Amino acid sequence: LAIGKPAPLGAHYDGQGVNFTLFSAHAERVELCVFDANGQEHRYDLPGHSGDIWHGYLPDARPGLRYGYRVHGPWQPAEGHRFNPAKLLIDPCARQIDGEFKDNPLLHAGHNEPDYRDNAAIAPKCVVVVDHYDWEDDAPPRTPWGSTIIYEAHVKGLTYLHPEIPVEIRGTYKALGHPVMINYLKQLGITALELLPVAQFASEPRLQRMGLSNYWGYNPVAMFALHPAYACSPETALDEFRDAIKALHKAGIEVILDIVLNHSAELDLDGPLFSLRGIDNRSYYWIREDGDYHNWTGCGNTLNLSHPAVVDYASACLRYWVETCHVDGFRFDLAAVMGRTPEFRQDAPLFTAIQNCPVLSQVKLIAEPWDIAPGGYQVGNFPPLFAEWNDHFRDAARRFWLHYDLPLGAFAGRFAASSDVFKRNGRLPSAAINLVTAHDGFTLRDCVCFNHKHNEANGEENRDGTNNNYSNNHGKEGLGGSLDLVERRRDSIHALLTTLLLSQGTPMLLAGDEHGHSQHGNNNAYCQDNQLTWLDWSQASSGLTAFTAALIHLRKRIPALVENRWWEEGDGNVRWLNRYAQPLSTDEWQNGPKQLQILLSDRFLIAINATLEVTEIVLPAGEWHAIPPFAGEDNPVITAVWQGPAHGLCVFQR
């Protein structure tokens, strides 16, 4: 093997061979492993070793070359070292994997002693590849944060059962860019399509043994590879995905990738050995004093995102998806791990690396500001470049409309972009990603049809999933029921949807919530790739869809919601009025009836009756007319006193 160069990261062909690079601070020797047409394996030590980077060059190596790594080093259970050359490892920067990660006993690295059985026969291989994709004139929409509306969707579930999409592309990357979806997305009014993880992932062994699979995809095995199962053309999925991205960009729609950098599919010490564990367990992961893993993600392991080599690796990965795939931003799963040096720091290595990266600092950065370990709760403590998922808005809103036990003041707070949380530093209202629901938990519809979760299909006897849903089945457990039950919850769904799309901040709507999508009571469908999870369009509600689309287009017309500036007492952006159209007093905010009016930019008014009985609300001065979707366009009815439904609302304009 030639000496090659200590960069770039991974394997890159240059016309006369391939240059292989691999990081490892504790490896004693690295063997590039190549395979011929007879499956026979050929091994070569990597000549190069600059710093902590091992490198080499294979002259005449052509794209399509299957390879893997074999790393020698200390096998010290107590010190957190797990080097086991008996197991073929994957290049952590591999851009394409060949093979499936099906459960197998040969994969385990070993407990106190390294398992000596060779795993080459059933271990997916990496594939040298070249990218000649022509981007033509694709440019980033760069949509203002003040006019952003995110739509969380699952690549397969979004179009798998869509009647208007050609059967052979449903559930694939190709579908995302088909005229049917692009048109729908545009007419609905969303600006950013956020996809559940698309970095090649595997199904954990525990899932495969239960006859299930990993549906969401929060279990990455190759962070630089595009998940092939969602591709129409697997051996060339990336081209397919980028074609869909061109289309979406042409229609002015952005693409945001949900991504996990906090853990790998290697899970805990009982999980399969794929890469990191055998390349440099000590460096890649957060190890405790006894050599075992720090389980701060609750997934088995936690990448040490503060380690310089890991920061390089991570930031290089994020850069790859932007430069090669042209995504418009990221949504970080269990983001707190990114700031976790031992403790969470807003100035942690990854954050400063992201902020100083000319490319990454230019895209949209969204975080789930926390992890499950003590000190991992970082709501409102992320760098000013990041926006944050506002889970407190999720629960607050649910409690306000479904439980009637939330102070009128707390709700007004959540509606005003949760200032008490983001109103610091140079952060704007848009840092608050408001959501009523998301992939985890109940769909919007199930929040009004179920009091309890029904996760028995997940195989854990309903022990899994959150127990704090703040839901209200309105009378009977389950979908359907009397016309009354149907109308009573339609009022709540309209109210929750309005709260979401009209609140100050960045709205994120969950795909399927516009049309009554249900998961039938399952509130943790992470392992369900079937109906109950896939969007059922043939059964979708056209009425609620239009109701939702009108809301989103109304928003774009309200200055107080699109300017993205904090509202100041009396500046005109908003006024809070009671049931008599009077400024709420001190008492009223504390224990007054849950009824108020929110007039924005003094031309739009939202009337709220969050009590259990129909009431009358006297509107402010002027001639107010209900507007779509609460009334028809060009509505001539002037409302002086609003007859408000129980736990409902209506919007007016003057």
Swiss-Prot record:
The active site is at 333 (nucleophile), 368 (proton donor). This is Glycogen debranching enzyme. Inhibited by iodoacetate, p-chloromercuribenzoate, HgCl(2), cupric sulfate and ammonium sulfate. Keywords: Carbohydrate metabolism, Glycogen metabolism, Glycosidase, Hydrolase. Gene3D superfamilies: Glycosidases, Golgi alpha-mannosidase II, Immunoglobulins. Disruption phenotype: Disruption of the gene leads to overproduction of glycogen containing short external chains. Belongs to the glycosyl hydrolase 13 family. Pfam families: Alpha-amylase (PF00128), CBM_48 (PF02922), GlgX_C (PF18390). One of its GO terms (biological process) is glycogen catabolic process. It comes from the Bacteria. Removes maltotriose and maltotetraose chains that are attached by 1,6-alpha-linkage to the limit dextrin main chain, generating a debranched limit dextrin. Shows only very little activity with native glycogen. One of its GO terms (molecular function) is amylo-alpha-1,6-glucosidase activity. It is an enzyme of class 3 (hydrolase). Optimum pH is 5.6 to 6.4. Its EC number is 3.2.1.196. Pathway: Glycan degradation; glycogen degradation. InterPro entries: GlgX_C (IPR040784), GlgX_Isoamylase_N_E_set (IPR044505), Glyco_hydro_13_cat_dom (IPR006047), Glyco_hydro_13_N (IPR004193), Glyco_hydro_b (IPR013780), Glycogen_debranch_bac (IPR022844), Glycogen_debranch_GlgX (IPR011837), Glycoside_hydrolase_SF (IPR017853). Residues 455-464 have a biased composition (Basic and acidic residues). It catalyses: Hydrolysis of (1->6)-alpha-D-glucosidic linkages to branches with degrees of polymerization of three or four glucose residues in limit dextrin. SMART domains: Aamy. Residues 455-476 are annotated as: Disordered. SUPFAM superfamilies: (Trans)glycosidases (SSF51445), E set domains (SSF81296).
